[PDB]
């Protein structure tokens, strides 16, 4: 299956607007995911990872993109903070895994990269696999909102990635392969 | 949708853009100070502009958020750190007048210079000229050419200039809500809002008053004893009875009496410990000086450091091509990027210094959690405190045995602990008579207290009264001794210097008692015991998020300033000088000066 096409591409996602490709009707092996890069994390929540080419699914989705160093641990089931709440929730109920590696030698920029934007504001918490990728003031007070203001402000903010930072604020990119199984 | 949300909202954007804006100012510094050239001398200048420009439109933004309806203590902080004006309170033109006269004045003092009698074309610089001479020099008569020349020739520069900066500054206090720029200084030591923990500005005098009589006993008798060794020196010009000449101290204010050490050693026959040699010979360099830092830190179950800091760092100076600013410095550039700049040689002055530098380091990545304005020390006097307790540990004789540079063989004695004390007392007690009576000149004359006509008469009985320091030669109103000092003419807080030492030893002591350490308290060597760590580490992490009386009840057990661990750390100094003073008098007269 054409797992290179995932981790190995020229830039990732945003994480407020996720790259999910879905890859069906296809032989998956699972040991090409360890040829791409050392990782900082593969865990693996409803399946072992030794077993995943016993396994059969209708569909696998390939959720990728770019997320801070600190905020890895927040891509899993029961987690808060910007990212579990506004860019990418997994259900509590979750089969699939997720791996995450650092790409500070691709990502960063000595003027700062700031083509990565992450939500930070939003009205109500996400759905499971829900995305939003609109770009609309967000109000925080009680007057009614007309262009950015005194009590409004976008919703998105860029994560300026530098080769200098440290690990926990370098950028990492990671994809998560969630399993799913209907009928055939 | 009330105010306290919406302040929450708004610290949370000025985090975010404050931690880009702020890493590209610091950033910038970094590249100057490790490269000095023009061109980053304007990319610092156009990147601090940059921040001062963002920190000034969210100060305004940041006034929409009254602090009245807000509950939670850590929004309330943040927004107290960001609603303070400052200068901006003042009319353009007052503004640009005070930023004038702070700059006239920086430098006045760093480009002053002050020629030889006779000889207009030999002239010197406060550093290293004057420095070296007010150091090194045994003849009375020049030590007093070099501090008349400095007072007459600076200090008359700087005088209307310190008269028109502290009627702007007052001007400035009182338009923020204070009593008088005195006020506004001790605003940093305020705790409000807090049940049991609060803390006035004005209660910070009365402490500082407080724990100063304590201290008076053990200071009175260090002065007595240095006493009877200058006099040996200066066998003509020191009265028995009376005050010590201030050109006499070893410095150019008297701010330290460390260059003092090689008149009173009081066992000279003994060498001080010293193991530079022990350095060299084992082929040591600036990368294991700061890998062992590192192991002390280590050992006591602190962090490691990370990656970015060892490929950063600029740990030795970079040669005779590439300029650098080689003061020791401790950065936290913002997002995790921390960094040590210093010129290291293989001395054991640099390696103290890498264990004081690196317990700065450490004390900003514990707090690195935070909220960006929260990033900074409980107050003034904690940050430094923090790395002296490291650099206090790394130079006792024990860690030099176990690290291997001290002999495994080598025998303490009493007369080497009675030459290492008096040594620090020299560099630490001596200081705090000058640093009191320093701020409290200051506090006095922004209080307006002291007219302008009687500055320089109120300023040199109370340097009588308190150091115990007498002028040689008159000075009438004309001069402004105080302003001849780095830290008056330029707009810093002095206090700083006093009651971070109280800091000092009495975060010592507690970490001794974790440690379990038996013996006296100079010796303690907090390595491994990762009892202390934690305890101390519990503290570090806060950042100003707590009270800083808090901060200090965690790992002191108590919630304010205190004496007894420092005169508990020079007890047996203590004991001996009041031994050898029991044929002197102990004390002084404020009547006799050597001009009269
Ligand atoms: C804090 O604990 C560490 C151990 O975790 C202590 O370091 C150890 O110190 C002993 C000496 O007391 C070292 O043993 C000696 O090593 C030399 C190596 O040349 C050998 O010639 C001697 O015969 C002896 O075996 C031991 O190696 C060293 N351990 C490590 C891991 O470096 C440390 O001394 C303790 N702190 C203090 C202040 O004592
Ligand atoms: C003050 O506000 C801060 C947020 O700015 C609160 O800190 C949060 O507390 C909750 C408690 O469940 C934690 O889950 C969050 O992770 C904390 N967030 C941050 C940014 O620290 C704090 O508890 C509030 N304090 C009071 C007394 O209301
Ligand atoms: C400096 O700070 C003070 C508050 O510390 C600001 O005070 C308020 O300013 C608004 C105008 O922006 C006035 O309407 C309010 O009456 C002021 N409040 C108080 C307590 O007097 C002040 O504006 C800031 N300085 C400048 C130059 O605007
Ligand atoms: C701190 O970093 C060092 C590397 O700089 C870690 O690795 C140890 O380094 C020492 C250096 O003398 C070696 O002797 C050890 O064998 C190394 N350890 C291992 C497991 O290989 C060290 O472990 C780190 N310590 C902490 C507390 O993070
Ligand atoms: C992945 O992202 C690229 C842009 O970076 C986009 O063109 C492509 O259509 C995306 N793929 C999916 C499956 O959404
Ligand atoms: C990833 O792509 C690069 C070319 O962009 C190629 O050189 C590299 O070998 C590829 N790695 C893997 C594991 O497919
Ligand atoms: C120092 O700054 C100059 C500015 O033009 C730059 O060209 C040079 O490479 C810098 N050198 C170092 C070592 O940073
Ligand atoms: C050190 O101890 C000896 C014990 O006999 C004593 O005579 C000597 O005076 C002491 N010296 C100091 C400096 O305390």
């Given amino acids: 299956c054409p797992f290179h096409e995932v981790f190995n591409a020229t830039r990732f996602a945003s994480v407020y607007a996720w790259n999910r490709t879905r890859i069906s009707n296809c032989v998956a092996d699972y040991s090409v995911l360890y040829n791409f890069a050392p990782f900082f994390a593969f865990k693996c929540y409803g399946v072992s990872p030794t077993k995943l080419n016993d396994l059969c699914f209708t569909n696998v989705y390939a959720d990728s993109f770019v997320i801070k160093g600190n905020e890895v641990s927040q891509i899993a089931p029961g987690q808060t903070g910007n990212i579990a709440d506004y860019n990418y929730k997994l259900p509590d109920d979750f089969t699939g895994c997720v791996i995450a590696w650092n790409s500070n030698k691709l990502d960063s920029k000595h003027s700062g990269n700031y083509d990565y934007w992450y939500r930070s504001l939003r009205k109500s918490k996400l759905k499971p696999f829900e995305r939003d990728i609109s770009t609309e003031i967000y109000q925080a007070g009680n007057k009614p909102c007309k262009g950015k203001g005194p009590n409004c402000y976008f919703p998105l903010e860029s994560y300026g990635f530098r080769p200098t930072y440290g690990v926990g604020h370098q950028p990492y990119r990671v994809v998560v392969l969630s399993f799913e199984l209907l009928h055939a | ?596």
């Fill in chain 2, 1 to 596: 949708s009330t105010i306290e949300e919406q302040a929450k909202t708004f610290l949370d954007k000025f985090n975010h853009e404050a931690e880009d804006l702020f890493y590209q100012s610091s950033l910038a510094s970094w590249n100057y100070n490790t490269n000095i050239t023009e061109e980053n001398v304007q990319n610092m200048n156009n990147a601090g502009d940059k921040w001062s420009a963002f920190l000034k439109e969210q100060s305004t933004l940041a006034q929409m958020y009254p602090l009245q309806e807000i509950q939670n203590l850590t929004v309330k902080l943040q927004l107290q750190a960001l609603q303070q004006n400052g200068s901006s309170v003042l009319s353009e033109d007052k503004s640009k007048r005070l930023n004038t006269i702070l700059n006239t004045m920086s430098t006045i003092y760093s480009t002053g210079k002050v020629c030889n009698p006779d000889n207009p074309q030999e002239c010197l610089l406060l550093e290293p000229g004057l420095n070296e001479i007010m150091a090194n020099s045994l003849d009375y008569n020049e030590r007093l050419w070099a501090w008349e020349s400095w007072r007459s020739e600076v200090g008359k520069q700087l005088r209307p200039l310190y008269e028109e900066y502290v009627v702007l500054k007052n001007e400035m206090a009182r338009a923020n809500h204070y009593e008088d720029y005195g006020d506004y200084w001790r605003g940093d030591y305020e705790v409000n809002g807090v049940d049991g923990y609060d803390y006035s500005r004005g209660q910070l005098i009365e402490d500082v008053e407080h724990t100063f009589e304590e201290i008076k006993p053990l200071y009175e008798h260090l002065h007595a004893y240095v006493r009877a060794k200058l006099m040996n020196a200066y066998p003509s010009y020191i009265s028995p009875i009376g005050c010590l000449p201030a050109h006499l101290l070893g410095d150019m204010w008297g701010r330290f009496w460390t260059n003092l050490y090689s008149l009173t050693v009081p066992f000279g026959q003994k060498p001080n410990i010293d193991v530079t040699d022990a350095m060299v010979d084992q082929a040591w360099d600036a990368q294991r000086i700061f890998k062992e830092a590192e192991k002390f830190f280590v050992s006591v179950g602190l962090p490691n450091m990370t990656q970015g800091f060892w490929e950063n760092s600029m740990l030795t100076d970079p040669g005779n091509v590439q300029k650098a600013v080689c003061h020791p410095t401790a950065w936290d550039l913002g997002k995790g990027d921390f960094r040590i700049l210093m010129c290291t040689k293989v001395t054991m002055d640099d390696f103290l210094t890498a264990h004081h530098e690196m317990g700065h380091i450490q004390y900003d990545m514990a707090y690195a959690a935070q909220p960006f304005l929260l990033r900074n020390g409980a107050n003034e006097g904690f940050h430094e405190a923090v790395g002296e307790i490291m650099s206090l540990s790394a130079a006792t004789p024990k860690h030099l045995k176990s690290i291997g540079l001290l002999s495994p063989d080598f025998q303490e004695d009493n007369e080497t602990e009675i030459n290492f004390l008096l040594k620090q007392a020299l560099t630490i007690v001596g200081t705090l008579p000058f640093t009191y009576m320093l701020e409290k000149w200051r506090w006095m004359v922004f209080k307006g207290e002291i007219p302008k006509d009687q500055w320089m008469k109120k300023w040199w009985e109370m340097k009588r009264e308190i150091v115990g320091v007498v002028e040689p030669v008159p000075h009438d109103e004309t001069y402004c001794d105080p302003a001849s000092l780095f830290h008056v003419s330029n707009d810093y807080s002095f206090i700083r210097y006093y009651t971070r030492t109280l800091y000092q030893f009495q975060f010592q002591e507690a970490l001794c008692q974790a440690a379990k350490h038996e013996g006296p308290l100079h010796k303690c060597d907090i390595s491994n015991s990762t009892e202390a760590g934690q305890k101390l580490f519990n503290m570090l992490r806060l950042g100003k998020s707590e009270p800083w009386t808090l901060a200090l009840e965690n790992v002191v057990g108590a919630k304010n300033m205190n004496v007894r661990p420092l005169l508990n750390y020079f007890e047996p100094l203590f004991t001996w000088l009041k031994d050898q003073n029991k044929n002197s008098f102990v004390g002084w007269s404020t009547d006799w000066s050597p001009y009269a």
